[PDB]
Amino acid sequence: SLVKLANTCAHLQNCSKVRVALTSIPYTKLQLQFAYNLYQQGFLSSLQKGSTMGPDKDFVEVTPDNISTRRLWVGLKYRDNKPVLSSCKLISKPNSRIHLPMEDMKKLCSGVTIRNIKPLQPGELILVRAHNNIMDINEAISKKLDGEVLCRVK
Amino acid sequence: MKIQTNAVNVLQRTSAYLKSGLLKETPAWYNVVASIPPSTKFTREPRFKNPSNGHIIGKLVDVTEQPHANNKGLYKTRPNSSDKRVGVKRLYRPPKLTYVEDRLRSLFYKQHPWELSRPKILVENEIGDENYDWSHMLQIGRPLDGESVIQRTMYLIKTKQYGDMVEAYDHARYEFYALRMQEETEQQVALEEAEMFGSLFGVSAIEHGIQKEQEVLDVWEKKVVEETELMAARTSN
Amino acid sequence: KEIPRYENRTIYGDIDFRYHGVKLHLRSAKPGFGLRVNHVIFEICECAGIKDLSGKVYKSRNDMNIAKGTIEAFTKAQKTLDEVALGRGKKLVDVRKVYYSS
Amino acid sequence: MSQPLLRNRSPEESELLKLKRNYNRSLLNFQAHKKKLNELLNLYHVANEFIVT
Amino acid sequence: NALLEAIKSRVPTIAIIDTDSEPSLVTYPIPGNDDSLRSVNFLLGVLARAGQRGLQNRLARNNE
Amino acid sequence: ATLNQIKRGSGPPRRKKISTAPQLDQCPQRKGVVLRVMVLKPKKPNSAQRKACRVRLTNGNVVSAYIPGEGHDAQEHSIVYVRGGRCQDLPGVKYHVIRGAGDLSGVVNRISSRSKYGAKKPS
Amino acid sequence: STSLWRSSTQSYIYGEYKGIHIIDLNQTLSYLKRAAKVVEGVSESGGIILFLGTRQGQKRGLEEAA
Amino acid sequence: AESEPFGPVDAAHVLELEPAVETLRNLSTVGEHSSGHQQSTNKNTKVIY
Amino acid sequence: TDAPPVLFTVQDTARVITLNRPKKLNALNAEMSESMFKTLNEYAKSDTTNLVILKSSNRPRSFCAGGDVATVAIFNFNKEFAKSIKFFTDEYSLNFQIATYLKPIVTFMDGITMGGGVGLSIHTPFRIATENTKWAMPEMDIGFFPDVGSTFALPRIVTLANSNSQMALYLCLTGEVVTGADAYMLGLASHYVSSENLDALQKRLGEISPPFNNDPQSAYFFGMVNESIDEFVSPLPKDYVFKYSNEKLNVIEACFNLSKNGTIEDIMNNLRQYEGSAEGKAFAQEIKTKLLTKSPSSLQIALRLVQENSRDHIESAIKRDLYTAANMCMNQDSLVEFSEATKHKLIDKQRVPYPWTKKEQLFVSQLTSITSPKPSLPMSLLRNTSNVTWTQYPYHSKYQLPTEQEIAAYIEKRTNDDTGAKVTEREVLNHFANVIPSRRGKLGIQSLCKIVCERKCEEVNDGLRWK
RNA sequence: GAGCGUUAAUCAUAAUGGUUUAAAGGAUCCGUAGAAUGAAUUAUAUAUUAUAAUUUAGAGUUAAUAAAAUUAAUUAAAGAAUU
RNA sequence: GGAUUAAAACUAGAGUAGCGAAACGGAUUCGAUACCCGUGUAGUUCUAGUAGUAAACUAUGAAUACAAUUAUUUAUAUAUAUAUAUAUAAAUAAUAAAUGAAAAUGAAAGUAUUCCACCUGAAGAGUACGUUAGCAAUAAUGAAACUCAAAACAAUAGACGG
RNA sequence: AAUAUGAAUUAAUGCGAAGUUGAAAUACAGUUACCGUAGGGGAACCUGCGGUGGGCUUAUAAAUAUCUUAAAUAUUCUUACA
Ligand SMILES: [K+]
Ligand SMILES: [K+]
Ligand SMILES: [K+]
Ligand SMILES: [K+]
Ligand SMILES: [K+]
Ligand SMILES: [K+]
Ligand SMILES: [Mg+2]
Ligand SMILES: [Mg+2]
Ligand SMILES: [Mg+2]
Ligand SMILES: [Mg+2]
Ligand SMILES: [Mg+2]
Ligand SMILES: [Mg+2]
Ligand SMILES: [Mg+2]
Ligand SMILES: [Mg+2]
Ligand SMILES: [Mg+2]
Ligand SMILES: [Mg+2]
Ligand SMILES: [Mg+2]
Ligand SMILES: [Mg+2]
Ligand SMILES: [Mg+2]
Ligand SMILES: [Mg+2]
Ligand SMILES: [Mg+2]
Ligand SMILES: [Mg+2]
Ligand SMILES: [Mg+2]
Ligand SMILES: [Mg+2]
Ligand SMILES: [Mg+2]
Ligand SMILES: [Mg+2]
Ligand SMILES: [Mg+2]
Ligand SMILES: [Mg+2]
Ligand SMILES: [Mg+2]
Ligand SMILES: [Mg+2]
Ligand SMILES: [Mg+2]
Ligand SMILES: [Mg+2]
């Protein structure tokens, strides 16, 4: 769901403004892939599976009995009195989805505004979804993949 | 109030003054602050345990952990509404510290109201010097009071001499009565023995109270008379 | 105040900053691009040492609030590559600068 | 990441779940039925004070 | 007033920060009760002796 | 507006100057015949005796044209050429007559800005 | 009092007890040691150290510290 | 990655250009008396007189 | 799919390495060592990592119970000598990388730190101990030698009764376990921090960064790391009393004082011919009992290495341990019992000591062969990003408690000064607690200085003489 | 500059917008179309869509237990005062 | 598209005490087609309908996810050394952050998402014409020409106030 | 029937200058203003009915207070005592 992803993007911005060290997001494949990309890129300190009440200390298998109570817990980073994850916005919106070929993704990473999408800025992360997998735009260009431009994180 | 930035970055703002040349001379604090960086995260931190009672914070009991029926005779097969509400706020709210001794302390002073009348000094001397062996109630350095009973009760339950808290508490209470009776006699006898050897005392406690009551009853006499004369005039109207 | 400058000529990336009623859209520019911005912003860039910059002002074009907004944007809306790298624990490479390196 | 997101209930787990859920519904129906009979008994004890003739 | 002037003047500051006090307004906060004279005088004394040791070490290096 | 409202027509209004000489019919100038020469009073705070003229254009539109320059020889039945441009202080006078065209002569003894007053160059 | 809490101090709180917040002394000690080293450094460097306290009774401590 | 090496050749691939050193070498073989000067790949257009 | 043996995580600008083998008490195998060795080379090249933190995920149960020698024993029984030599080349190469690492490494010794664990901390100037620390080198009971460069570290860092490596030989030959505060006072731990304060300390370590134009490899940053840890140090428990009394320190300093060609028999003679207090005499018998339940060959090899790696540079000392380990797994001359003893204790649970058979006295040539590289087996330590060697640790002294040789140097210097003044115990305490910048206010520094003066100095008039 | 000016026109010059109080929230709700938008897991396909199976966090149904006596429509009554 | 929709008004049949447009008188006033007083018709009431308009206002469309505190009630639940205490929601009040032209908003007028309605200088004008609906009053829909460089909001310091 | 043109005839409105008759609005604007609707009047406007605040949140006391060693002891204290 792009709506759920929009909710998570706004939630992370709200948490950064108040500078909470730990927060939770919905437990879904897309959310987990989204969070994992942020973790590998250094935007998130930690990524743990858990419940509504907090991160799990020991592995708890997820089943239909507890799926409704599952959450993903992420740790936010702050350095030099500044949040590492300052902004998080969707590019492809629920009511206007944007699919780009690899050629247009290369233009976006080169400073060209494609379909009103402002080009990639220094130190910014743009994520792309292709065949239900989320990857960095630079990685999609390396794999010659065409996909939906989901969001941009800075 | 907004998280301030300029108080913790004095070193970085100063460094720009020196590099540009706006400030010719390095301040004396400059080197000290550089070697000892200020903390500048100002984040809210989660907590997963109450330090007082060791209760775990942030743990959800899954339905798989409640296989048996409840007090109503029903099994739990699905999460309830409370289980489905995010509880992040509990991770950040300062835990309420609780102690079993607090319950006993309230009981002791409910059973012995006049123990409250014995003045207590809250000013600490040195908490780290307290070397107490609670096998006995009396201790060198601290008064005999309700706390002596509570600590004795805990030692009994900690050593497992008694199982029920009530039994340990009752045992400690009797030890407290014995010590209180020996002191009430030492004071009575000491006064009696001194008077028998020619000790003289200016004012007794009973006398002190009479004098203080006289001072108050004298002002009260004047006002009563004054207010019983204004009434007579005002009522005459 | 000191303002971060990328290669001591321009800003780090693009800035979309709102100062009261003034909407400032500033874009970094290539070497030799010059200053193509509101006249108020031009003077500030000259004193600050910014040589290449593009941008547009939207909504309110009050000179006083443009100047203050610009100064605030140059400090509160920029992040150096070094600061981004340290916060994220990653290496950030300027491809154009590496292309002309040994 | 390699862990599966969800593990489907085994056929046996679904059987035990259905047993508990059927029991829960049956117990509540029985308890309500017995409560109604206990109120009918307490009403019989006092029907000698009620007038119908 | 004093804290804001120190910020404007780039003067590092130390302060006792109680639960109702803003930590970010000082360079080096010390969390602690600021209402009791015993608590304040205990913390002030420690800082004062630390300064004294620094002063004695500076006067000692001058002698030798 | 929402994305669907924009799809249905919602959008920013367009900015384009509107015609201030509708009677000319998108022509640089139109010939006309003076119906009556008149003198009008500026709207406040201006004071003057502004010379104007009512003109019937070759397209049938009747307009009021300001006669620029010091002194004019325009009369009734005189052939005049009318161009765009309003007289700001005279409401309803939205056009100008061209000096030195038709039966309206150039300003007598004009030295500066002669081209604007139909004055030929002195030898 | 917990009623007067400035939530920006949340990370310094050990818990609440008897209607007041208990400050975490483990953090106080670490902050106190850090602050003390700064005072020692500035003193050893010859800097001017000003002690400001305007609550009743603080003068005696302030004068001796200086 | 924080410890990933990135050099001029890697940058050239990113920008889809020949390495800068190659450009310098190709610009030194342009002189009429310089080494490497070659022009024959174009002699493949049928002409009739 | 399986939990990785070692977990790597980012802590702001600090990189946390966590040992993740709880069921094995964080035992170090070739996989763990190789992973850590490779990841540390990358962090050395990185310009965003300021320091590294080596901890365990099992604290306070254990930090590292020692290298995985039970698996090396099975290799020997299966003649998989190539596998065994790989395990020691990886471990010893990782110990050499840590010793010469140019960025601060901070080891949290929160639990059992025995064997390989000692190699993970002994080579770092910032080795923090806790109440749960249990330092020991129990190799003599398994038939092995003191490895992981412990024959180069202990003779150079121990604080008391270590003038001639007497205390170093006592710990390596007896396998005595030192606990918490005692490890800090002996010099085994640079700092003593309560376990409860480790979380806060870790966060502060990630937040500190070199100032201005100083790299994390500069001495200036090393001082900053030391100060940060000190802010979390707390005063020792009031009841705490040092483990070894002066009388017990006199037995070790005399009974383990050998020459450049000493032998384990010489130590046995001193322990059997010791004279003095009743406690000292009884203490010497306790050591004699213990030293007679060890491997007769291991004790001689340990003494050889201590007398060889106490005056050599780090690289040659670590390399000599690789040769010894390889020359022991492959028992060409049937002079050791490392493999059989290891199975008797680890592979098979047997409280009783392994009955020893090699009870002879190896010659100087025999010891040389066991501790020298065989020309047929070429083994070399993996290359690190520093590739440097030196005879003295570059930072250990500045940030640990002073040794008995440093206090002596100041008494001799002060006593031989033109001032013509008298050295007084009070002046010694002040000079070590309130003078040296890196030692100012160091925990348990005055207590250690008083132990040294009461046992090493002679108080005549208002002066002190170095007996 | 052999053009210059002027008139007539075209493009550009702010929606990288707004609607408490400045132009602008429909009196309110119900609900049809929507070529509007919208959960979870897995597997395929021709792939942000389709299909199938599965799931319960949205949305509902029925009970049990406790709580409340209001809001509509209708019928039947009361009250102080006024003329 | 449908339904409901204050007051006034209208169509029938009842009712009509009090109140009360209008009208007729009395005062006040330079004058008083007013304010005040009298007599007081429609109306105000009920029954059955028509009509669908209000400063019909929170001048703020609905829904979902989310973000820092306090106080005060309410509800549910839990516990007991039985009346408090501990929890979780709702409401209200004051706020942090954020937003804003500011006044201020404060869980939205914040961070986001989805759908609908609506606006594009003033005046002309919610007017003209046409159409639709209604017994009617009217309601809905809804322009252009001409003219002008205005027009409007928040806030600031004054001046003034029967 | 539509489109266009003129058209008897007839409706609404803008601007321009000053005057005339009142003083309706802005302060409690001298009867609170305004919204819907109805009736009336030279003109603004007046009156009835309901609604709104873009007017009254502009909100600010029926007062009364207590006992333990006043000092040879607290008040002094400068890294000392322990
Ligand atoms: K607004
Ligand atoms: K009536
Ligand atoms: K709507
Ligand atoms: K009026
Ligand atoms: K009205
Ligand atoms: K009216
Ligand atoms: Mg306070
Ligand atoms: Mg030309
Ligand atoms: Mg445009
Ligand atoms: Mg809106
Ligand atoms: Mg509304
Ligand atoms: Mg409206
Ligand atoms: Mg439900
Ligand atoms: Mg009403
Ligand atoms: Mg009627
Ligand atoms: Mg009349
Ligand atoms: Mg009259
Ligand atoms: Mg009347
Ligand atoms: Mg109707
Ligand atoms: Mg109307
Ligand atoms: Mg309306
Ligand atoms: Mg209403
Ligand atoms: Mg609804
Ligand atoms: Mg109408
Ligand atoms: Mg206003
Ligand atoms: Mg009047
Ligand atoms: Mg008036
Ligand atoms: Mg009025
Ligand atoms: Mg009237
Ligand atoms: Mg009215
Ligand atoms: Mg008003
Ligand atoms: Mg008001």
Side-chain angles (χ1 to χ4, degrees), chain I residues 96-113:
Chain I
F96 185 60
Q97 186 189 29
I98 290 166
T100 60
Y101 211 75
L102 305 191
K103 290 183 193 171
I105 298 185
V106 181
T107 307
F108 294 171
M109 298 178 320
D110 199 306
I112 299 159
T113 303

Side-chain angles (χ1 to χ4, degrees), chain A residues 65-101:
Chain A
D65 299 284
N66 64 1
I67 187 60
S68 68
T69 64
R70 295 305 92 184
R71 299 288 292 189
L72 287 167
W73 292 86
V74 296
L76 302 171
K77 301 172 66 178
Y78 307 86
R79 195 182 172 272
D80 298 358
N81 212 7
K82 290 177 182 183
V84 173
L85 172 64
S86 53
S87 59
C88 182
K89 182 193 171 181
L90 294 179
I91 290 164
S92 166
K93 285 180 60 181
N95 71 345
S96 51
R97 313 221 167 174
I98 302 178
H99 184 276
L100 295 186

